[PDB]
Amino acid sequence: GNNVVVLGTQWGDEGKGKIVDLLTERAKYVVRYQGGHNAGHTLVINGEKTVLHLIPSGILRENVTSIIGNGVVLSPAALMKEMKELEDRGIPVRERLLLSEACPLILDYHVALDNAREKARGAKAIGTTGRGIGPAYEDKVARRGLRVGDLFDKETFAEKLKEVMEYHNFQLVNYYKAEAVDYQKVLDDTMAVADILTSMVVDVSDLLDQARQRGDFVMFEGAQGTLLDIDHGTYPYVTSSNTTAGGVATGSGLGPRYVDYVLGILKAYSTRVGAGPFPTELFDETGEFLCKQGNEFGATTGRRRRTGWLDTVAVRRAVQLNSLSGFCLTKLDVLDGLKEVKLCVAYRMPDGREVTTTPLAADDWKGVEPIYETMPGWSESTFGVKDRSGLPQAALNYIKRIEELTGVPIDIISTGPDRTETMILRDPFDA
Amino acid sequence: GNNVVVLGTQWGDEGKGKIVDLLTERAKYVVRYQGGHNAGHTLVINGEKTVLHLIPSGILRENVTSIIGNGVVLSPAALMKEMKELEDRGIPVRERLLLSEACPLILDYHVALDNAREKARGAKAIGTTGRGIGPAYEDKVARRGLRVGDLFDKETFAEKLKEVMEYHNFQLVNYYKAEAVDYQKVLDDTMAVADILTSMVVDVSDLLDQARQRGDFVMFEGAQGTLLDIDHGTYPYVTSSNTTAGGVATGSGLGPRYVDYVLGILKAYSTRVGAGPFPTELFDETGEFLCKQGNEFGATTGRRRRTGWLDTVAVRRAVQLNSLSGFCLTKLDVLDGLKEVKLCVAYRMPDGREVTTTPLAADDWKGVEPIYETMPGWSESTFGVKDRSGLPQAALNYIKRIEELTGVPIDIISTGPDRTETMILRDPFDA
Numbered sequence: 116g117n118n119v120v121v122l123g124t125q126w127g128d129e130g131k132g133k134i135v136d137l138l139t140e141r142a143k144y145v146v147r148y149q150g151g152h153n154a155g156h157t158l159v160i161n162g163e164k165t166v167l168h169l170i171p172s173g174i175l176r177e178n179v180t181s182i183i184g185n186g187v188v189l190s191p192a193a194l195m196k197e198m199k200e201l202e203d204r205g206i207p208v209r210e211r212l213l214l215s216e217a218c219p220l221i222l223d224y225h226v227a228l229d230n231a232r233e234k235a236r237g238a239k240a241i242g243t244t245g246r247g248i249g250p251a252y253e254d255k256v257a258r259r260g261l262r263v264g265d266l267f268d269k270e271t272f273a274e275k276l277k278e279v280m281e282y283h284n285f286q287l288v289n290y291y292k293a294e295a296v297d298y299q300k301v302l303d304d305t306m307a308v309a310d311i312l313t314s315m316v317v318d319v320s321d322l323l324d325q326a327r328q329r330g331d332f333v334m335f336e337g338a339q340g341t342l343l344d345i346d347h348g349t350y351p352y353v354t355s356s357n358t359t360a361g362g363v364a365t366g367s368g369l370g371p372r373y374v375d376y377v378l379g380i381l382k383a384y385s386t387r388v389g390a391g392p393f394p395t396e397l398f399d400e401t402g403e404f405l406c407k408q409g410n411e412f413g414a415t416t417g418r419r420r421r422t423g424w425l426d427t428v429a430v431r432r433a434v435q436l437n438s439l440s441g442f443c444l445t446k447l448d449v450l451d452g453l454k455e456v457k458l459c460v461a462y463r464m465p466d467g468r469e470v471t472t473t474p475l476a477a478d479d480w481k482g483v484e485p486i487y488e489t490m491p492g493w494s495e496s497t498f499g500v501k502d503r504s505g506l507p508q509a510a511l512n513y514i515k516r517i518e519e520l521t522g523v524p525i526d527i528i529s530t531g532p533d534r535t536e537t538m539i540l541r542d543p544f545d546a
Numbered sequence: 547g548n549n550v551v552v553l554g555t556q557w558g559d560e561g562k563g564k565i566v567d568l569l570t571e572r573a574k575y576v577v578r579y580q581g582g583h584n585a586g587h588t589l590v591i592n593g594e595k596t597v598l599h600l601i602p603s604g605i606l607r608e609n610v611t612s613i614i615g616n617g618v619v620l621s622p623a624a625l626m627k628e629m630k631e632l633e634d635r636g637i638p639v640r641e642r643l644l645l646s647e648a649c650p651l652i653l654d655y656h657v658a659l660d661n662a663r664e665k666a667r668g669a670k671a672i673g674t675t676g677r678g679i680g681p682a683y684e685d686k687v688a689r690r691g692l693r694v695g696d697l698f699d700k701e702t703f704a705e706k707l708k709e710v711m712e713y714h715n716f717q718l719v720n721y722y723k724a725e726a727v728d729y730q731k732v733l734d735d736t737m738a739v740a741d742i743l744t745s746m747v748v749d750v751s752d753l754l755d756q757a758r759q760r761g762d763f764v765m766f767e768g769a770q771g772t773l774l775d776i777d778h779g780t781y782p783y784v785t786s787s788n789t790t791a792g793g794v795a796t797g798s799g800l801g802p803r804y805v806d807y808v809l810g811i812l813k814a815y816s817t818r819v820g821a822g823p824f825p826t827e828l829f830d831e832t833g834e835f836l837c838k839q840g841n842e843f844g845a846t847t848g849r850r851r852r853t854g855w856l857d858t859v860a861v862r863r864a865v866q867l868n869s870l871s872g873f874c875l876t877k878l879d880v881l882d883g884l885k886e887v888k889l890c891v892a893y894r895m896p897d898g899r900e901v902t903t904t905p906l907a908a909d910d911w912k913g914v915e916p917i918y919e920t921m922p923g924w925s926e927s928t929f930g931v932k933d934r935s936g937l938p939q940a941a942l943n944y945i946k947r948i949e950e951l952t953g954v955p956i957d958i959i960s961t962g963p964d965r966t967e968t969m970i971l972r973d974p975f976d977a
């Protein structure tokens with residue numbers, strides 16, 4: 116189908132970037148519809164590494180127009196920052212990237228607040244990336260936030276910003292007893308890049324409407340993961356945006372009926388970065404092994420990711436929430452060497468019940484326990500394989516099992532960070 | 547199609563309630579996915595009137611299960627308030643209504659803030675309904691808000707609420723120099739209804755997933771209108787929720803691919819309640835006539851609604867944003883008697899250009915001017931007609947024209963507030 120969606124089923128870091136970059140070969144457009152620069156999508160072409168945050172994972176391709184949709188919270192500083200680095204490496208970002216005037220702007224004070232709010236939580240801190248995503252989303256919904264479009268008139272922008280910062284500073288100064296952000300400094304840093312910024316503006320909805328009617332291949336690239344959804348995730352240990360497929364339509368302007376394929380990116384095991392429920396979490400040799408073998412560190416904060424077995428109970432929440440058409444099974448290779456591999460098939464509630472559905476808010480996950488199905492591991496190397504034939508029967512079995520347990524076909528299998536260490540079995544652009 | 551969406555194309559008050567109540571005859575479920583009690587949907591059966599706010603417009607039917615989806619901001623006070631009134635009238639609300647534990651809770655302090663924030667805007671006040679929708683949405687996205695589920699543990703709820711209210715009161719007291727809301731009073735009022743509240747909780751996503759696989763007829767009922775969308779509307783003179791079709795999926799948990807039909811409710815003319823751009827606004831006899839003839843007053847605040855001609859430019863923004871499958875043309879009857887009726891076909895930008903697309907943020911709408919197409923009015927009565935044959939050729943022409951100008955069929959035509967003064971031409975449940 117023309118419109119293909121690529122999002123994280125678990126808790127982010129499944130490998131969305133890599134799959135976006137590999138599938139965009141046929142795409143005219145790639146659109147990030149939510150998140151900000153908390154995302155850290157790692158691309159790897161012939162070993163050259165690139166971790167993108169704010170800029171879409173289609174940038175390395177000239178044939179693709181990279182779009183930052185209205186649903187994304189935009190940090191002008193982060194953009195220039197990533198833009199230049201990409202430019203020095205021969206990526207004419209500016210020549211291939213478009214923006215939404217609706218995009219709310221993340222400015223320094225948003226990080227002051229995000230910082231303040233996290234400390235104030237003490238032991239109960241979310242584990243935010245520190246980029247100010249939340250405060251930006253807050254101001255948005257509040258209707259006091261500034262968006263890309265406010266830059267069209269620098270005089271009124273300065274006025275608007277003044278009020279905003281005043282309000283924000285009152286609280287940072289008085290309630291939090293925090294260091295106040297300087298208005299003049301924010302105004303200057305921003306105006307220094309406004310033209311560049313505004314130069315990339317496009318009417319993203321209308322674009323997608325016409326690109327749609329034309330039959331063009333659009334790829335929407337997600338940020339974070341399903342269980343981090345502001346609504347459906349382990350609230351409040353979530354991200355402030357709708358990481359679920361519904362976000363595609365709200366964060367871009369493309370009507371919901373135009374989604375043709377939702378590919379759920381699914382890692383061979385599970386990880387979490389930040390605080391929050393994790394039934395299948397491993398704190399043993401296997402835990403460290405999974406970490407070590409899969410270089411599980413934040414592509415944005417460098418924090419150690421928590422590791423655990425693949426959770427089928429929670430993945431099926433992802434299935435229904437997202438309208439998955441298929442899964443792309445990533446990082447199978449990291450499982451090589453393990454004698455047995457486990458997959459949680461059910462949850463044992465603290466009251467005794469065996470359930471196969473998941474809790475919602477974090478509190479409701481407290482004493483929940485995982486029930487596994489233990490399958491044979493494999494000795495063979497999986498890394499770099501691009502043909503099921505190269506996969507040992509155990510792995511194939513493990514793949515079939517996941518499919519059985521979910522009722523969704525694993526259309527793509529990834530065997531390495533490199534764009535080429537993958538096997539596409541069914542290409543979403545054909546379905 | 548099984549899953550039918552009914553939302554406001556313009557600026558709310560198009561007649562969503564009436565159409566939900568009329569189409570639910572075949573529905574097993576009706577789901578409100580966004581908004582709160584700012585909505586005021588008026589139903590009218592054999593002249594008996596009912597204006598619903600928070601409770602879905604399927605309530606008057608026993609065969610229908612009414613759902614308040616996660617995307618809705620829930621005011622426990624408003625619920626009990628509406629619940630009892632409905633009950634005294636023989637509507638066993640409790641026996642037919644379900645809720646989401648994800649639903650954020652709107653509590654008294656949210657109204658203090660919404661009040662404070664509006665005055666602080668002075669001349670630039672949004673024109674909020676005063677129900678505290680925004681602050682509730684803010685806290686949500688902020689990750690400090692309380693949701694229905696927090697009630698499962700009253701002790702931790704009280705703790706949580708305490709912190710929350712402390713934080714909120716600091717600002718109401720110090721920054722705004724406003725009256726502080728009393729913690730104890732909020733705690734008590736709330737706990738008095740928690741059990742009733744929690745008694746209606748259901749896992750809405752999973753419900754919809756199974757109801758979906760079963761082939762059941764679901765109806766999603768929208769609140770407000772398309773140009774009030776937090777992202778795509780005339781920001782900041784908008785509502786804090788995603789009134790666009792993308793909201794259905796984010797505010798319920800039903801995967802985006804499961805929408806089968808999006809019926810855009812379209813009024814025969816235009817109205818706005820609150821501040822904000824309105825190209826076709828009428829301040830003349832026609833303006834007052836439209837007001838008078840269509841009893842254009844807020845079904846929630848009783849404010850006088852602003853009236854204007856039907857705007858085709860903005861309606862087409864609604865078309866693409868929403869994936870409209872069809873329009874339900876409402877309040878044609880109110881046009882009876884007019885010598886000529888106008889419909890804006892284009893916008894004259896303040897720089898001279900003729901455009902047929904719309905601006906985004908409110909500021910960008912400033913000097914914009916409407917270009918009309920003037921059509922013949924009609925003398926005949928339209929009110930109560932349920933057969934196109936009863937519609938005079940002028941009206942039919944006016945209908946064809948709207949269709950020509952949009953490329954979307956007017957599947958339903960409404961000729962009165964009563965459920966029966968309507969003609970369904972194509973029933974969304976069949977498409």
Ligand SMILES: Nc1nc2c(ncn2[C@@H]2O[C@H](COP(=O)(O)OP(=O)(O)O)[C@@H](O)[C@H]2O)c(=O)[nH]1
Binds near residue numbers: 131156157158446449
């Ligand atoms: N070993 C291995 N690494 C992979 C594979 N796919 C992606 N990676 C690496 O897995 C990590 C995915 O992390 P991250 O980039 O945070 O994922 P994203 O946030 O979804 O794009 C990166 O460090 C990638 O280079 C794979 O199939 N095998």
Ligand SMILES: Nc1nc2c(ncn2[C@@H]2O[C@H](COP(=O)(O)OP(=O)(O)O)[C@@H](O)[C@H]2O)c(=O)[nH]1
Binds near residue numbers: 586590876960962963
């Ligand atoms: N005259 C007339 N009134 C209608 C018609 N459809 C609905 N109404 C009235 O139009 C108004 C719609 O206002 P509101 O209820 O705020 O619309 P909603 O918010 O979309 O449900 C109500 O007062 C209805 O009783 C119609 O076709 N003709």
Ligand SMILES: O=C1NC(=O)[C@@]2(N1)O[C@H](COP(=O)(O)O)[C@@H](O)[C@H]2O
Binds near residue numbers: 244247249353390
């Ligand atoms: O990109 C992200 N991955 C996360 O899990 C995370 N953000 O989502 C949650 C919210 O933080 P933020 O506001 O930085 O997205 C945190 O657990 C944080 O680590």
Ligand SMILES: O=C1NC(=O)[C@@]2(N1)O[C@H](COP(=O)(O)O)[C@@H](O)[C@H]2O
Binds near residue numbers: 674675785818
């Ligand atoms: O139900 C509503 N209809 C509106 O237009 C409105 N709310 O949307 C905007 C935001 O107010 P609220 O926060 O009350 O929805 C206001 O113009 C308000 O009138």
Ligand SMILES: O=CN(O)CC(=O)O
Binds near residue numbers: 127388415
């Ligand atoms: O790739 C995204 N990371 O998990 C964010 C971080 O490093 O915190």
Ligand SMILES: O=CN(O)CC(=O)O
Binds near residue numbers: 585587675845847
């Ligand atoms: O029907 C909804 N109204 O327009 C809200 C109000 O009265 O303000």
Ligand SMILES: O=P([O-])([O-])O
Binds near residue numbers: 126153340
């Ligand atoms: O990286 P991420 O997962 O998107 O945040």
Ligand SMILES: O=P([O-])([O-])O
Binds near residue numbers: 587
């Ligand atoms: O009444 P509404 O339009 O939904 O708010």
Ligand SMILES: [Mg+2]
Binds near residue numbers: 129156157414
């Ligand atoms: Mg990442």
Ligand SMILES: [Mg+2]
Binds near residue numbers: 558559585
């Ligand atoms: Mg109304």
